[PDB]
């Protein structure tokens, strides 16, 4: 699934980040990083879900998780 995160999309992300030239090995690297990020955030989120005895990860679950990772997001409940 992670490979589903395509080279041209990562190109796009880099571009917004001001990157002109991209090494061939960057894509696998980026995937690994993105996977650690999503893992760290989702784990926390789902912990909030389970604590709330829900079967459904809410956006607030993600917002609280993000806030705990010091990755505070505005626009979804806080």
């Amino acid at each position: 699934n992670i490979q589903g995160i395509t080279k041209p999309a990562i190109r796009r992300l880099a571009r917004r980040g001001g990157v002109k030239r991209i090494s061939g090995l960057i894509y696998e690297e980026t995937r690994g990083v993105l996977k650690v990020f999503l893992e760290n955030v989702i784990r926390d989120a789902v912990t909030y879900t389970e604590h709330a005895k829900r079967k459904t990860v809410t956006a607030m679950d993600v917002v609280y998780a993000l806030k705990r990772q010091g990755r505070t997001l505005y626009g979804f409940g806080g």
Binding site: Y48, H51, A52, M60, Y64, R68
Partner: peptide, 10 residues
């Protein structure tokens, strides 16, 4: 802290 927050959220 985390506990008081959990309690609040629910």
């Amino acid at each position: 802290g985390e506990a008081s927050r959990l309690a609040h959220y629910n």
